[PDB]
Amino acid sequence: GLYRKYIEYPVLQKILIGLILGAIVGLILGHYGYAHAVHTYVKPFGDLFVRLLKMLVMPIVFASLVVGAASISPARLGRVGVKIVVYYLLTSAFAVTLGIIMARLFNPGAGIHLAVGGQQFQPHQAPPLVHILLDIVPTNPFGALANGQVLPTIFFAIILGIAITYLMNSENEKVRKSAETLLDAINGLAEAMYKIVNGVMQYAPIGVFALIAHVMAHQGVHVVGELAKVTAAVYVGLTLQILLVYFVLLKIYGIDPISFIKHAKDAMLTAFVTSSSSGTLPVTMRVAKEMGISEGIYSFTLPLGATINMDGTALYQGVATFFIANALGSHLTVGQQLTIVLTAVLASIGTAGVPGAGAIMLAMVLHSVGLPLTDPNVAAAYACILGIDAILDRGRTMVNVTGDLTGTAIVAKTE
Ligand SMILES: N[C@@H](CC(=O)O)C(=O)O
Ligand code: NA
Ligand code: NA
Ligand code: NA
């Protein structure tokens, strides 16, 4: 009885109730010194929610790209393929430098007290540029899928989808029949994961309550007291300028920006709370069909950008890099400035759709400039931003969904 009424209630309204209620509970318990109780009991519910999101990432990226590539003729795929990737990279480059310019302009936040605390080990070492490019080709298609390789999975999935299109045009009857059966089985898998995503989203209000309450109990209230500069800079930076960057581009091509945000408003809110771009992928598909985009375009452009187009994460890479540098007191000249821009674009590509990938992947960007994590002072500052990661995680996922959706609208208008 009561279980049913909990279901028909709209999902988005439930999340805001959980997020707001979680905020109140965390502050009260933290003030009375019950943080230890929250860590032992409340936290495990939040941990389960995170593990559910990581489960869906790989079965959905492989299946969606195979179906997306197989639904476009090879001639049309080349034209849309080159245009979508160039938009993705250029906005990524602009996103990194946008954080760079105002980080110098805004207060760097050098003044901070640090303690050794916990230390990270084995800092991520950057291989030579030729080596990371040759690793896109999977030496074992099954091994890359099982061993948590994302970039090789995309490379193999796209080729497999293109090869199926050639088979469905073959003269032999047996070849066509077997090619259709293979595509249907993969398509059925892709549709199944969308149903599981809806099922997981029903547990999200409980999961968001645990994750949010845990933050303020330990250190969440400290954002206003200290480190207000780093949290304000990303919010004044990532949210504001990039949304109007979308506004001007749509105006140039003749599309009204205010109509775009109204139709896609639900996409940002679901990405704001669940922290996963891949988890919100089915919602973006629902938005696209109502907007009027043809089926062939967004069926392929949207899945590809869920792992490639991540402007929010790229911006976050630049601002956090200076925060580590300012804490150490070191100074970076233009030579390190260029290296940050290049590595941040590469680093944003390597991240997956899981929420917490931003912090772990950031080791590549810092190591390129220097200051390895073996330094306890570097580790001390690095281990601190992990606490405020959850609050800043929400901003990064939100804009990435719009950045993916913005490109499809621009591209689809061209044809
Ligand atoms: N969850 C982000 C990635 C990150 O936060 O590192 C995204 O997929 O857009
Ligand atoms: Na981009
Ligand atoms: Na990525
Ligand atoms: Na994205």
mmCIF file of all heavy atoms in Angstrom, residues 171-216:
data_model
loop_
_atom_site.group_PDB
_atom_site.id
_atom_site.type_symbol
_atom_site.label_atom_id
_atom_site.label_comp_id
_atom_site.label_asym_id
_atom_site.label_seq_id
_atom_site.Cartn_x
_atom_site.Cartn_y
_atom_site.Cartn_z
ATOM 1 N N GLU A 171 24.556 -9.358 -50.345
ATOM 2 C CA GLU A 171 23.629 -10.068 -51.221
ATOM 3 C C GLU A 171 23.197 -11.398 -50.613
ATOM 4 O O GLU A 171 22.061 -11.840 -50.817
ATOM 5 C CB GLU A 171 24.268 -10.288 -52.594
ATOM 6 C CG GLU A 171 24.383 -9.051 -53.505
ATOM 7 C CD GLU A 171 23.173 -8.119 -53.504
ATOM 8 O OE1 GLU A 171 22.045 -8.550 -53.180
ATOM 9 O OE2 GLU A 171 23.347 -6.949 -53.905
ATOM 10 N N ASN A 172 24.090 -12.052 -49.873
ATOM 11 C CA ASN A 172 23.791 -13.368 -49.320
ATOM 12 C C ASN A 172 22.690 -13.268 -48.271
ATOM 13 O O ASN A 172 22.733 -12.404 -47.390
ATOM 14 C CB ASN A 172 25.051 -13.983 -48.715
ATOM 15 C CG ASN A 172 24.887 -15.455 -48.388
ATOM 16 O OD1 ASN A 172 23.827 -16.040 -48.616
ATOM 17 N ND2 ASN A 172 25.938 -16.061 -47.852
ATOM 18 N N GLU A 173 21.701 -14.158 -48.369
ATOM 19 C CA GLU A 173 20.578 -14.126 -47.437
ATOM 20 C C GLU A 173 21.005 -14.523 -46.030
ATOM 21 O O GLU A 173 20.549 -13.927 -45.047
ATOM 22 C CB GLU A 173 19.460 -15.043 -47.932
ATOM 23 C CG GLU A 173 18.810 -14.586 -49.224
ATOM 24 C CD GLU A 173 18.045 -13.287 -49.058
ATOM 25 O OE1 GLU A 173 17.509 -13.052 -47.955
ATOM 26 O OE2 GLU A 173 17.980 -12.504 -50.028
ATOM 27 N N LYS A 174 21.872 -15.531 -45.912
ATOM 28 C CA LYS A 174 22.281 -16.002 -44.593
ATOM 29 C C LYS A 174 23.084 -14.943 -43.850
ATOM 30 O O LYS A 174 22.962 -14.805 -42.627
ATOM 31 C CB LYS A 174 23.087 -17.293 -44.727
ATOM 32 C CG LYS A 174 23.294 -18.029 -43.415
ATOM 33 C CD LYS A 174 24.498 -18.953 -43.484
ATOM 34 C CE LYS A 174 24.213 -20.275 -42.792
ATOM 35 N NZ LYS A 174 24.061 -20.114 -41.320
ATOM 36 N N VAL A 175 23.919 -14.191 -44.569
ATOM 37 C CA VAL A 175 24.732 -13.161 -43.928
ATOM 38 C C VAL A 175 23.852 -12.057 -43.356
ATOM 39 O O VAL A 175 24.082 -11.580 -42.238
ATOM 40 C CB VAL A 175 25.766 -12.605 -44.923
ATOM 41 C CG1 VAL A 175 26.580 -11.498 -44.278
ATOM 42 C CG2 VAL A 175 26.672 -13.717 -45.417
ATOM 43 N N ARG A 176 22.837 -11.627 -44.109
ATOM 44 C CA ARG A 176 21.955 -10.571 -43.623
ATOM 45 C C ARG A 176 21.169 -11.022 -42.398
ATOM 46 O O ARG A 176 21.010 -10.257 -41.440
ATOM 47 C CB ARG A 176 21.002 -10.124 -44.729
ATOM 48 C CG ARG A 176 21.658 -9.305 -45.823
ATOM 49 C CD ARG A 176 20.641 -8.429 -46.533
ATOM 50 N NE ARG A 176 19.624 -9.208 -47.226
ATOM 51 C CZ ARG A 176 19.667 -9.517 -48.514
ATOM 52 N NH1 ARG A 176 20.673 -9.140 -49.283
ATOM 53 N NH2 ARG A 176 18.672 -10.223 -49.045
ATOM 54 N N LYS A 177 20.665 -12.257 -42.413
ATOM 55 C CA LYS A 177 19.860 -12.741 -41.296
ATOM 56 C C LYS A 177 20.680 -12.822 -40.016
ATOM 57 O O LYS A 177 20.197 -12.456 -38.938
ATOM 58 C CB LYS A 177 19.260 -14.105 -41.633
ATOM 59 C CG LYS A 177 18.369 -14.671 -40.540
ATOM 60 C CD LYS A 177 17.958 -16.103 -40.840
ATOM 61 C CE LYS A 177 19.167 -17.019 -40.931
ATOM 62 N NZ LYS A 177 18.779 -18.419 -41.255
ATOM 63 N N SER A 178 21.921 -13.301 -40.111
ATOM 64 C CA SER A 178 22.764 -13.400 -38.925
ATOM 65 C C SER A 178 23.202 -12.029 -38.429
ATOM 66 O O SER A 178 23.393 -11.840 -37.223
ATOM 67 C CB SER A 178 23.981 -14.276 -39.216
ATOM 68 O OG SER A 178 24.695 -13.800 -40.341
ATOM 69 N N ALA A 179 23.377 -11.065 -39.336
ATOM 70 C CA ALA A 179 23.755 -9.719 -38.919
ATOM 71 C C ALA A 179 22.620 -9.030 -38.173
ATOM 72 O O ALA A 179 22.861 -8.295 -37.208
ATOM 73 C CB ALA A 179 24.180 -8.894 -40.132
ATOM 74 N N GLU A 180 21.377 -9.243 -38.612
ATOM 75 C CA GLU A 180 20.234 -8.656 -37.917
ATOM 76 C C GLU A 180 20.080 -9.236 -36.517
ATOM 77 O O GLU A 180 19.754 -8.510 -35.571
ATOM 78 C CB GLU A 180 18.957 -8.871 -38.726
ATOM 79 C CG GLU A 180 18.960 -8.190 -40.083
ATOM 80 C CD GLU A 180 17.730 -8.525 -40.904
ATOM 81 O OE1 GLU A 180 16.871 -9.283 -40.407
ATOM 82 O OE2 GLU A 180 17.623 -8.031 -42.046
ATOM 83 N N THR A 181 20.297 -10.545 -36.368
ATOM 84 C CA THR A 181 20.164 -11.173 -35.058
ATOM 85 C C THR A 181 21.201 -10.637 -34.079
ATOM 86 O O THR A 181 20.895 -10.405 -32.904
ATOM 87 C CB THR A 181 20.284 -12.691 -35.190
ATOM 88 O OG1 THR A 181 19.272 -13.176 -36.080
ATOM 89 C CG2 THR A 181 20.115 -13.359 -33.837
ATOM 90 N N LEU A 182 22.436 -10.436 -34.545
ATOM 91 C CA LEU A 182 23.477 -9.903 -33.671
ATOM 92 C C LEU A 182 23.141 -8.493 -33.205
ATOM 93 O O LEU A 182 23.355 -8.151 -32.036
ATOM 94 C CB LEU A 182 24.826 -9.921 -34.389
ATOM 95 C CG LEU A 182 26.014 -9.381 -33.591
ATOM 96 C CD1 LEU A 182 26.279 -10.248 -32.372
ATOM 97 C CD2 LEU A 182 27.252 -9.289 -34.465
ATOM 98 N N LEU A 183 22.618 -7.658 -34.105
ATOM 99 C CA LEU A 183 22.282 -6.288 -33.733
ATOM 100 C C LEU A 183 21.115 -6.246 -32.754
ATOM 101 O O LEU A 183 21.105 -5.427 -31.828
ATOM 102 C CB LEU A 183 21.963 -5.470 -34.983
ATOM 103 C CG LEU A 183 21.768 -3.969 -34.770
ATOM 104 C CD1 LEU A 183 22.989 -3.366 -34.097
ATOM 105 C CD2 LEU A 183 21.483 -3.274 -36.090
ATOM 106 N N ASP A 184 20.119 -7.114 -32.946
ATOM 107 C CA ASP A 184 18.966 -7.130 -32.051
ATOM 108 C C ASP A 184 19.363 -7.534 -30.637
ATOM 109 O O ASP A 184 18.860 -6.966 -29.660
ATOM 110 C CB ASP A 184 17.891 -8.068 -32.595
ATOM 111 C CG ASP A 184 17.157 -7.484 -33.782
ATOM 112 O OD1 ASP A 184 17.514 -6.366 -34.210
ATOM 113 O OD2 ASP A 184 16.222 -8.140 -34.286
ATOM 114 N N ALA A 185 20.252 -8.522 -30.505
ATOM 115 C CA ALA A 185 20.693 -8.945 -29.180
ATOM 116 C C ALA A 185 21.421 -7.822 -28.454
ATOM 117 O O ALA A 185 21.214 -7.612 -27.254
ATOM 118 C CB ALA A 185 21.585 -10.179 -29.295
ATOM 119 N N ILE A 186 22.282 -7.091 -29.165
ATOM 120 C CA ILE A 186 22.983 -5.969 -28.551
ATOM 121 C C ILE A 186 22.010 -4.841 -28.231
ATOM 122 O O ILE A 186 22.118 -4.188 -27.187
ATOM 123 C CB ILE A 186 24.127 -5.493 -29.464
ATOM 124 C CG1 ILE A 186 25.112 -6.635 -29.717
ATOM 125 C CG2 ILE A 186 24.842 -4.304 -28.848
ATOM 126 C CD1 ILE A 186 26.308 -6.233 -30.545
ATOM 127 N N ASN A 187 21.046 -4.595 -29.121
ATOM 128 C CA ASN A 187 20.045 -3.565 -28.861
ATOM 129 C C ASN A 187 19.204 -3.910 -27.640
ATOM 130 O O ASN A 187 18.861 -3.029 -26.844
ATOM 131 C CB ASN A 187 19.155 -3.375 -30.089
ATOM 132 C CG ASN A 187 18.199 -2.210 -29.944
ATOM 133 O OD1 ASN A 187 18.346 -1.377 -29.051
ATOM 134 N ND2 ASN A 187 17.208 -2.148 -30.823
ATOM 135 N N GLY A 188 18.856 -5.187 -27.478
ATOM 136 C CA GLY A 188 18.093 -5.592 -26.310
ATOM 137 C C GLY A 188 18.845 -5.359 -25.014
ATOM 138 O O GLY A 188 18.251 -5.000 -23.995
ATOM 139 N N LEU A 189 20.163 -5.569 -25.033
ATOM 140 C CA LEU A 189 20.972 -5.301 -23.848
ATOM 141 C C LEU A 189 20.974 -3.817 -23.506
ATOM 142 O O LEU A 189 20.891 -3.445 -22.330
ATOM 143 C CB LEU A 189 22.399 -5.802 -24.061
ATOM 144 C CG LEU A 189 23.390 -5.520 -22.930
ATOM 145 C CD1 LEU A 189 22.973 -6.242 -21.660
ATOM 146 C CD2 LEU A 189 24.798 -5.918 -23.337
ATOM 147 N N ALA A 190 21.070 -2.952 -24.519
ATOM 148 C CA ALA A 190 21.086 -1.515 -24.270
ATOM 149 C C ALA A 190 19.783 -1.045 -23.639
ATOM 150 O O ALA A 190 19.792 -0.226 -22.713
ATOM 151 C CB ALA A 190 21.352 -0.758 -25.571
ATOM 152 N N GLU A 191 18.648 -1.549 -24.129
ATOM 153 C CA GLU A 191 17.361 -1.163 -23.563
ATOM 154 C C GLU A 191 17.195 -1.677 -22.140
ATOM 155 O O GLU A 191 16.526 -1.034 -21.325
ATOM 156 C CB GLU A 191 16.224 -1.674 -24.447
ATOM 157 C CG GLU A 191 16.237 -1.120 -25.860
ATOM 158 C CD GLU A 191 15.825 0.337 -25.926
ATOM 159 O OE1 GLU A 191 15.273 0.850 -24.929
ATOM 160 O OE2 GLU A 191 16.052 0.972 -26.977
ATOM 161 N N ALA A 192 17.784 -2.833 -21.827
ATOM 162 C CA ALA A 192 17.657 -3.394 -20.486
ATOM 163 C C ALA A 192 18.325 -2.507 -19.442
ATOM 164 O O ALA A 192 17.788 -2.326 -18.344
ATOM 165 C CB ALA A 192 18.245 -4.802 -20.448
ATOM 166 N N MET A 193 19.496 -1.951 -19.762
ATOM 167 C CA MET A 193 20.199 -1.115 -18.793
ATOM 168 C C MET A 193 19.444 0.174 -18.500
ATOM 169 O O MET A 193 19.578 0.730 -17.404
ATOM 170 C CB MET A 193 21.611 -0.798 -19.286
ATOM 171 C CG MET A 193 22.315 -1.960 -19.961
ATOM 172 S SD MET A 193 22.746 -3.303 -18.837
ATOM 173 C CE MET A 193 23.271 -2.394 -17.386
ATOM 174 N N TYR A 194 18.654 0.670 -19.455
ATOM 175 C CA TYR A 194 17.851 1.859 -19.192
ATOM 176 C C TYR A 194 16.782 1.575 -18.144
ATOM 177 O O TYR A 194 16.468 2.439 -17.318
ATOM 178 C CB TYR A 194 17.213 2.370 -20.483
ATOM 179 C CG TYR A 194 18.202 2.709 -21.576
ATOM 180 C CD1 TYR A 194 17.850 2.600 -22.913
ATOM 181 C CD2 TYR A 194 19.482 3.147 -21.270
ATOM 182 C CE1 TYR A 194 18.747 2.912 -23.914
ATOM 183 C CE2 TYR A 194 20.385 3.459 -22.265
ATOM 184 C CZ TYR A 194 20.013 3.341 -23.584
ATOM 185 O OH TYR A 194 20.910 3.653 -24.577
ATOM 186 N N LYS A 195 16.205 0.372 -18.171
ATOM 187 C CA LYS A 195 15.230 -0.003 -17.152
ATOM 188 C C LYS A 195 15.876 -0.084 -15.776
ATOM 189 O O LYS A 195 15.281 0.336 -14.777
ATOM 190 C CB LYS A 195 14.575 -1.333 -17.518
ATOM 191 C CG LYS A 195 13.383 -1.197 -18.445
ATOM 192 C CD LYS A 195 12.273 -0.397 -17.791
ATOM 193 C CE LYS A 195 11.075 -0.264 -18.714
ATOM 194 N NZ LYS A 195 11.442 0.397 -19.996
ATOM 195 N N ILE A 196 17.091 -0.628 -15.703
ATOM 196 C CA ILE A 196 17.788 -0.716 -14.424
ATOM 197 C C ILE A 196 18.121 0.676 -13.902
ATOM 198 O O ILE A 196 18.086 0.923 -12.692
ATOM 199 C CB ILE A 196 19.048 -1.589 -14.563
ATOM 200 C CG1 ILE A 196 18.684 -2.951 -15.156
ATOM 201 C CG2 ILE A 196 19.719 -1.774 -13.217
ATOM 202 C CD1 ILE A 196 19.866 -3.874 -15.332
ATOM 203 N N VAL A 197 18.443 1.606 -14.803
ATOM 204 C CA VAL A 197 18.726 2.980 -14.393
ATOM 205 C C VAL A 197 17.508 3.596 -13.717
ATOM 206 O O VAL A 197 17.628 4.282 -12.696
ATOM 207 C CB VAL A 197 19.188 3.814 -15.601
ATOM 208 C CG1 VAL A 197 19.105 5.294 -15.287
ATOM 209 C CG2 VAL A 197 20.604 3.436 -15.993
ATOM 210 N N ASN A 198 16.317 3.357 -14.271
ATOM 211 C CA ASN A 198 15.099 3.847 -13.637
ATOM 212 C C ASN A 198 14.901 3.217 -12.265
ATOM 213 O O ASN A 198 14.472 3.890 -11.320
ATOM 214 C CB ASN A 198 13.891 3.571 -14.532
ATOM 215 C CG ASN A 198 13.979 4.282 -15.865
ATOM 216 O OD1 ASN A 198 14.920 5.033 -16.121
ATOM 217 N ND2 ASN A 198 12.995 4.050 -16.725
ATOM 218 N N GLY A 199 15.203 1.925 -12.137
ATOM 219 C CA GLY A 199 15.070 1.270 -10.846
ATOM 220 C C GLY A 199 16.029 1.818 -9.808
ATOM 221 O O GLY A 199 15.677 1.957 -8.634
ATOM 222 N N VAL A 200 17.258 2.132 -10.225
ATOM 223 C CA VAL A 200 18.241 2.682 -9.298
ATOM 224 C C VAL A 200 17.828 4.077 -8.842
ATOM 225 O O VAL A 200 18.027 4.448 -7.679
ATOM 226 C CB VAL A 200 19.639 2.683 -9.942
ATOM 227 C CG1 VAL A 200 20.639 3.395 -9.050
ATOM 228 C CG2 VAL A 200 20.094 1.262 -10.207
ATOM 229 N N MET A 201 17.243 4.869 -9.744
ATOM 230 C CA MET A 201 16.865 6.236 -9.404
ATOM 231 C C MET A 201 15.807 6.293 -8.311
ATOM 232 O O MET A 201 15.672 7.326 -7.648
ATOM 233 C CB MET A 201 16.358 6.967 -10.647
ATOM 234 C CG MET A 201 17.449 7.325 -11.636
ATOM 235 S SD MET A 201 18.944 7.940 -10.845
ATOM 236 C CE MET A 201 19.745 8.733 -12.234
ATOM 237 N N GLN A 202 15.049 5.212 -8.110
ATOM 238 C CA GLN A 202 14.094 5.179 -7.009
ATOM 239 C C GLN A 202 14.798 5.087 -5.662
ATOM 240 O O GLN A 202 14.280 5.584 -4.657
ATOM 241 C CB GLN A 202 13.127 4.010 -7.186
ATOM 242 C CG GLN A 202 12.222 4.135 -8.401
ATOM 243 C CD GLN A 202 11.121 5.160 -8.215
ATOM 244 O OE1 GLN A 202 10.976 5.748 -7.144
ATOM 245 N NE2 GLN A 202 10.342 5.384 -9.265
ATOM 246 N N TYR A 203 15.967 4.448 -5.619
ATOM 247 C CA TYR A 203 16.769 4.384 -4.405
ATOM 248 C C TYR A 203 17.606 5.640 -4.193
ATOM 249 O O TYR A 203 18.143 5.832 -3.098
ATOM 250 C CB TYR A 203 17.671 3.144 -4.450
ATOM 251 C CG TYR A 203 18.639 3.023 -3.296
ATOM 252 C CD1 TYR A 203 18.211 2.590 -2.050
ATOM 253 C CD2 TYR A 203 19.982 3.334 -3.455
ATOM 254 C CE1 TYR A 203 19.091 2.476 -0.993
ATOM 255 C CE2 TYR A 203 20.869 3.223 -2.404
ATOM 256 C CZ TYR A 203 20.418 2.794 -1.176
ATOM 257 O OH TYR A 203 21.299 2.682 -0.126
ATOM 258 N N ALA A 204 17.706 6.501 -5.205
ATOM 259 C CA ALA A 204 18.523 7.705 -5.085
ATOM 260 C C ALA A 204 18.148 8.606 -3.911
ATOM 261 O O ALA A 204 19.072 9.105 -3.245
ATOM 262 C CB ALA A 204 18.475 8.492 -6.401
ATOM 263 N N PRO A 205 16.868 8.875 -3.607
ATOM 264 C CA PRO A 205 16.582 9.763 -2.465
ATOM 265 C C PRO A 205 17.163 9.266 -1.153
ATOM 266 O O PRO A 205 17.586 10.079 -0.322
ATOM 267 C CB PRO A 205 15.046 9.809 -2.426
ATOM 268 C CG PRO A 205 14.594 8.654 -3.244
ATOM 269 C CD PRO A 205 15.629 8.478 -4.297
ATOM 270 N N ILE A 206 17.192 7.951 -0.941
ATOM 271 C CA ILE A 206 17.850 7.410 0.244
ATOM 272 C C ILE A 206 19.361 7.568 0.134
ATOM 273 O O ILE A 206 20.036 7.910 1.111
ATOM 274 C CB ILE A 206 17.448 5.940 0.454
ATOM 275 C CG1 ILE A 206 15.926 5.796 0.426
ATOM 276 C CG2 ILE A 206 18.007 5.420 1.767
ATOM 277 C CD1 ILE A 206 15.449 4.367 0.542
ATOM 278 N N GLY A 207 19.916 7.317 -1.054
ATOM 279 C CA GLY A 207 21.354 7.433 -1.228
ATOM 280 C C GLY A 207 21.853 8.858 -1.100
ATOM 281 O O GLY A 207 22.902 9.105 -0.499
ATOM 282 N N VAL A 208 21.116 9.816 -1.667
ATOM 283 C CA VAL A 208 21.513 11.217 -1.564
ATOM 284 C C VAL A 208 21.447 11.689 -0.117
ATOM 285 O O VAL A 208 22.280 12.490 0.320
ATOM 286 C CB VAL A 208 20.638 12.085 -2.488
ATOM 287 C CG1 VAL A 208 20.926 13.561 -2.272
ATOM 288 C CG2 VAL A 208 20.872 11.707 -3.940
ATOM 289 N N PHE A 209 20.472 11.194 0.650
ATOM 290 C CA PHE A 209 20.363 11.578 2.053
ATOM 291 C C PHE A 209 21.608 11.177 2.834
ATOM 292 O O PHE A 209 22.096 11.942 3.674
ATOM 293 C CB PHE A 209 19.112 10.945 2.665
ATOM 294 C CG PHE A 209 18.919 11.253 4.124
ATOM 295 C CD1 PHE A 209 18.211 12.375 4.519
ATOM 296 C CD2 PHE A 209 19.436 10.417 5.100
ATOM 297 C CE1 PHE A 209 18.029 12.661 5.859
ATOM 298 C CE2 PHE A 209 19.257 10.698 6.440
ATOM 299 C CZ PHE A 209 18.553 11.820 6.819
ATOM 300 N N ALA A 210 22.136 9.980 2.574
ATOM 301 C CA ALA A 210 23.308 9.515 3.309
ATOM 302 C C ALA A 210 24.569 10.258 2.882
ATOM 303 O O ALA A 210 25.378 10.653 3.728
ATOM 304 C CB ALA A 210 23.481 8.011 3.119
ATOM 305 N N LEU A 211 24.759 10.449 1.574
ATOM 306 C CA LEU A 211 25.966 11.113 1.090
ATOM 307 C C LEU A 211 26.032 12.560 1.557
ATOM 308 O O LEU A 211 27.092 13.036 1.983
ATOM 309 C CB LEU A 211 26.030 11.044 -0.436
ATOM 310 C CG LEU A 211 26.157 9.660 -1.070
ATOM 311 C CD1 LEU A 211 26.100 9.762 -2.585
ATOM 312 C CD2 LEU A 211 27.444 8.987 -0.628
ATOM 313 N N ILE A 212 24.913 13.280 1.481
ATOM 314 C CA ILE A 212 24.916 14.697 1.833
ATOM 315 C C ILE A 212 25.094 14.883 3.335
ATOM 316 O O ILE A 212 25.888 15.721 3.777
ATOM 317 C CB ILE A 212 23.631 15.370 1.319
ATOM 318 C CG1 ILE A 212 23.604 15.350 -0.209
ATOM 319 C CG2 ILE A 212 23.535 16.795 1.814
ATOM 320 C CD1 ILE A 212 24.828 15.972 -0.836
ATOM 321 N N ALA A 213 24.375 14.098 4.143
ATOM 322 C CA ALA A 213 24.463 14.249 5.593
ATOM 323 C C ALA A 213 25.872 13.964 6.096
ATOM 324 O O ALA A 213 26.338 14.593 7.054
ATOM 325 C CB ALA A 213 23.454 13.328 6.279
ATOM 326 N N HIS A 214 26.562 13.010 5.469
ATOM 327 C CA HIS A 214 27.924 12.680 5.874
ATOM 328 C C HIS A 214 28.867 13.862 5.681
ATOM 329 O O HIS A 214 29.837 14.020 6.432
ATOM 330 C CB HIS A 214 28.415 11.464 5.089
ATOM 331 C CG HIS A 214 29.790 11.011 5.466
ATOM 332 N ND1 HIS A 214 30.928 11.537 4.895
ATOM 333 C CD2 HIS A 214 30.210 10.074 6.347
ATOM 334 C CE1 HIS A 214 31.991 10.947 5.413
ATOM 335 N NE2 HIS A 214 31.583 10.055 6.297
ATOM 336 N N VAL A 215 28.604 14.698 4.675
ATOM 337 C CA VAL A 215 29.531 15.776 4.338
ATOM 338 C C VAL A 215 29.582 16.821 5.449
ATOM 339 O O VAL A 215 30.664 17.203 5.911
ATOM 340 C CB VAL A 215 29.147 16.407 2.989
ATOM 341 C CG1 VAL A 215 29.903 17.707 2.777
ATOM 342 C CG2 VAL A 215 29.425 15.436 1.854
ATOM 343 N N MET A 216 28.418 17.293 5.904
ATOM 344 C CA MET A 216 28.408 18.378 6.884
ATOM 345 C C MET A 216 28.801 17.892 8.272
ATOM 346 O O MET A 216 29.310 18.674 9.084
ATOM 347 C CB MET A 216 27.043 19.063 6.924
ATOM 348 C CG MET A 216 26.801 20.007 5.762
ATOM 349 S SD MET A 216 26.495 19.143 4.222
ATOM 350 C CE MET A 216 24.837 18.571 4.547
#
